[PDB]
Amino acid sequence: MYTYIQNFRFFAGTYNVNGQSPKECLRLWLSNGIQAPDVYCVGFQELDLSKEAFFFHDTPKEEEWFKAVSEGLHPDAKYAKVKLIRLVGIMLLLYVKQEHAAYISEVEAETVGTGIMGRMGNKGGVAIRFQFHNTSICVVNSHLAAHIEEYERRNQDYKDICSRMQFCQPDPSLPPLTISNHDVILWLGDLNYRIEELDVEKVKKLIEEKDFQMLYAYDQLKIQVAAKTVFEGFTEGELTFQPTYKYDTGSDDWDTSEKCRAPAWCDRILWKGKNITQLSYQSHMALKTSDHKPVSSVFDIGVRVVAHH
Numbered sequence: 001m002y003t004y005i006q007n008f009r010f011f012a013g014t015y016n017v018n019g020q021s022p023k024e025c026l027r028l029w030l031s032n033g034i035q036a037p038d039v040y041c042v043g044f045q046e047l048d049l050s051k052e053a054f055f056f057h058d059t060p061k062e063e064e065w066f067k068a069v070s071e072g073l074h075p076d077a078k079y080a081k082v083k084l085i086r087l088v089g090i091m092l093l094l095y096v097k098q099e100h101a102a103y104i105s106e107v108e109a110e111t112v113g114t115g116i117m118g119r120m121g122n123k124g125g126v127a128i129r130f131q132f133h134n135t136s137i138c139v140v141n142s143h144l145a146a147h148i149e150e151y152e153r154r155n156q157d158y159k160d161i162c163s164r165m166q167f168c169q170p171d172p173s174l175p176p177l178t179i180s181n182h183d184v185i186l187w188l189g190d191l192n193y194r195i196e197e198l199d200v201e202k203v204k205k206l207i208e209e210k211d212f213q214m215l216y217a218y219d220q221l222k223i224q225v226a227a228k229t230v231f232e233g234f235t236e237g238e239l240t241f242q243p244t245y246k247y248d249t250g251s252d253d254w255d256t257s258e259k260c261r262a263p264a265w266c267d268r269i270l271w272k273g274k275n276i277t278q279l280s281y282q283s284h285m286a287l288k289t290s291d292h293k294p295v296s297s298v299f300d301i302g303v304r305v306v307a308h309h
C-alpha cells in the first residue's frame, strides 16, 4: 500500500483561570465561529491556587473545569477524551472526534516543575505526546516565571521543561523521547513574557490607538526568540488582539489595584513542525471569570494516513 498526507482541524487553547471555578459557559472560547475541530488541545493555568493543591493533593477544580470544557466543545461532533495531565494548577486536555480515536496510539503524559527551588509545580509545564495515524504529535502547556524583570528565569524555565521532559518509547535502547523528537509540536500556556522599556501609560495608550505592531516591537518573547535564547525554530502568528493581562475579575477594565499592573501578552500559542497552517489567532474578551483572557488558535495540520485496498 502507500501513505498520503490528509489535513486535520486542530484546536489549541490556553486560559489562566486564576484559581477560580467556571462561572461562564466555555462555548464562546472553545466553539464560537468555528467548524467542529478534529482534535482539541485545551490547556490551563492556576486551576487551583490553594495550599492543599500546592502540596500535590487532589482538587474539585479538576472535574469542575473538565465538565465545563466538555460541554463548551463543538455540538456538531461527539468528542472522546484521549488524556488528562495536571501538575498542581497546570492542566492539559486532549479530545478527538470519536471517528479518530481508533487511529490514536502511543499516548504519553509527563510533568516538569520549574517553580520554587526550580522543582515545585507552582510554575512549570505539562505535556501530552501521541501518534495520530502515522504522525508523532506533542502538545505542551507551560506556565513560566512571573514579573517583568524575570525574563532570564523564563528562558531557563523553557530550557528546563525541554531538557527534563522525557517520554518513554517502545525501544528501550533508543535515547528518551524529548519534545523536539516529534513531527508536530504545539506549545501553549501562560508564558508570562511582558512588555519592556515602555511606561504603563504608553502601553495603555498604544492599546487604545490599537497599534499592536508598535507594542509588539517591545515584546520580551519576540526579543528573546530573536536572540535565539527561547523557542528556537518555533513560529508564532501575528498578534491582532489586545494583551490578555491584567483585568479586574468580572470586567474588561485594566487592573485597578494598588499594584496597577501594566498590560502584557502573557498567553501565547507557538508551533514547530512540517505541514502546519494557522487559520486563526484570537483572544476572548467575553469571558470575565479571571484577570486573564482565554486565547485560541485553529490549525490545518497534515497527517500521514495509510491507503489500503
Ligand SMILES: O=P(O)(O)Oc1cc(OP(=O)(O)O)c(OP(=O)(O)O)cc1OP(=O)(O)O
Pocket (backbone or CB within 6 Å): 001, 002, 308, 309
Ligand atoms: O510488507 P508487505 O506484506 O509486502 O506489504 C503489505 C503489508 C500489509 O500489512 P500486513 O503486514 O500484511 O498485515 C498489507 O495488509 P493490508 O491489506 O494493507 O491490510 C498489505 C501489503 O501489501 P499490499 O496488499 O498493500 O500491496
